Amino acid sequence: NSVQQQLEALEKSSGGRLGVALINTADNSQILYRADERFAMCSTSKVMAAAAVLKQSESDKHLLNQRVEIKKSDLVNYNPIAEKHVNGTMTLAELGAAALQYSDNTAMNKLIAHLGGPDKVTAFARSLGDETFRLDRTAPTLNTAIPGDPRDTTTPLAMAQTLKNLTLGKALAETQRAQLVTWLKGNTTGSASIRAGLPKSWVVGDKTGSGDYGTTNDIAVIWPENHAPLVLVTYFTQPEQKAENRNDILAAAAKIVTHGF
Ligand SMILES: *C(=O)[C@@H](NC(=O)/C(=N\OC(C)(C)C(=O)O)c1csc(N)n1)[C@H](C)NS(=O)(=O)O
């Protein structure tokens, strides 16, 4: 059956709602499934916050090494890196690395605070031509992922387009683009998500997110060995608040849409 039929069948088996957008940069073709529907981004939103700081750094050569004080009161629900630095400092670069590669929620919050609040992350997305993205809350409440809640949402297509712009395209000056890509490639949290649906030796940069309603997300740039890059967003969410997360669904979707590549 067709790729579309395969995705529909995956969603049917899934017990939830699947959103996929793949951009094949070889020919600019797309594989879209519920790609204009809103999903809670959860921690995939951290890419936008880190990139907003990278944009600022273009015009401030001291920004990435700027010290940020980490206090006990900054710790939240999940902060494996920031907890190592309580009573000390981390640089903005180190906070970007922790936010993206470990999904440290304290690090995300420091990025947001530095920028001046969630609305400034939204403004940065808008500056990239993304009319869809919105950040409304800090971590961890940005991961509540309540069905139909527009807060902290985007669509798979909007996020795939913006991720392509960020990592391979026109959003950031070169040094900054390269830094974002280095961060994403070194992600530690994505083994069982998109990466698990791909050949083991393909190079991937990604950012995961998991929240309530079993909301299980991953956004990736994928470099095949003999082909142009693919940009892939896989979002998944479920009807019940305490549903288990389902990274296996994301891996399955990735395998479906990258077949033949
Ligand atoms: C981002 O998506 C972020 N999610 C959370 O902080 C929530 N749970 O995360 C962990 C991994 C601890 C979990 O047990 O699911 C969460 C659930 S409900 C709520 N308000 N927050 C995590 C840290 N990012 S990820 O990339 O590791 O998924």
Side-chain angles (χ1 to χ4, degrees), residues 2-261:
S2 74
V3 171
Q4 283 296 324
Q5 288 168 325
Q6 293 169 230
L7 291 173
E8 297 171 63
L10 174 58
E11 182 179 63
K12 190 169 192 71
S13 68
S14 75
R17 178 170 60 108
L18 177 65
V20 176
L22 179 145
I23 300 169
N24 190 343
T25 73
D27 62 0
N28 314 317
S29 65
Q30 300 176 345
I31 300 171
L32 304 182
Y33 190 87
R34 300 193 188 286
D36 291 314
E37 299 186 20
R38 283 184 180 279
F39 294 76
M41 290 180 284
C42 300
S43 295
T44 70
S45 64
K46 297 182 184 177
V47 175
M48 202 69 69
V53 174
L54 290 171
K55 174 58 63 181
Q56 293 183 318
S57 79
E58 288 186 27
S59 61
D60 176 0
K61 72 188 179 288
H62 302 294
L63 187 63
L64 290 182
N65 287 332
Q66 180 178 143
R67 287 173 169 186
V68 178
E69 296 283 337
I70 309 305
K71 312 278 184 193
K72 181 174 165 182
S73 65
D74 293 322
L75 303 183
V76 291
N77 67 318
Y78 188 88
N79 38 254
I81 309 307
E83 72 178 356
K84 303 177 186 192
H85 298 281
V86 167
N87 297 314
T89 60
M90 295 173 68
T91 66
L92 283 169
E94 288 163 352
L95 290 158
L100 296 187
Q101 300 188 326
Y102 294 89
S103 214
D104 189 297
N105 279 342
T106 295
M108 170 58 150
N109 289 344
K110 294 295 192 183
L111 299 173
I112 297 169
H114 167 74
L115 292 164
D119 62 309
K120 298 279 181 172
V121 186
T122 305
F124 174 68
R126 292 290 177 275
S127 82
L128 304 187
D130 186 326
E131 211 205 325
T132 309
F133 178 101
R134 53 184 288 178
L135 197 70
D136 296 273
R137 290 171 293 167
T138 61
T141 64
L142 68 83
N143 310 282
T144 53
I146 298 156
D149 187 344
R151 292 177 293 173
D152 311 296
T153 61
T154 196
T155 67
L157 180 60
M159 188 61 108
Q161 293 170 328
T162 301
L163 187 64
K164 177 177 159 281
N165 282 333
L166 284 168
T167 60
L168 297 166
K170 62 189 153 58
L172 295 170
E174 181 54 31
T175 296
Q176 289 74 30
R177 183 200 71 77
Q179 180 61 265
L180 180 62
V181 166
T182 296
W183 283 335
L184 293 168
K185 285 180 176 177
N187 183 34
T188 71
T189 68
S191 184
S193 301
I194 286 168
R195 288 162 192 262
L198 305 177
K200 292 163 181 172
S201 60
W202 281 8
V203 174
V204 177
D206 82 294
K207 179 74 195 79
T208 51
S210 285
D212 274 352
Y213 294 86
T215 300
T216 314
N217 295 336
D218 198 16
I219 72 177
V221 187
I222 300 161
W223 290 261
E225 175 55 31
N226 304 119
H227 287 86
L230 310 172
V231 179
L232 177 57
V233 171
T234 58
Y235 284 170
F236 181 68
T237 191
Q238 295 171 78
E240 73 277 44
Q241 179 175 52
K242 292 179 169 185
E244 67 169 339
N245 302 100
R246 295 293 305 276
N247 288 282
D248 61 323
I249 295 301
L250 309 187
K255 185 177 191 180
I256 287 162
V257 300
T258 63
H259 190 78
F261 297 140

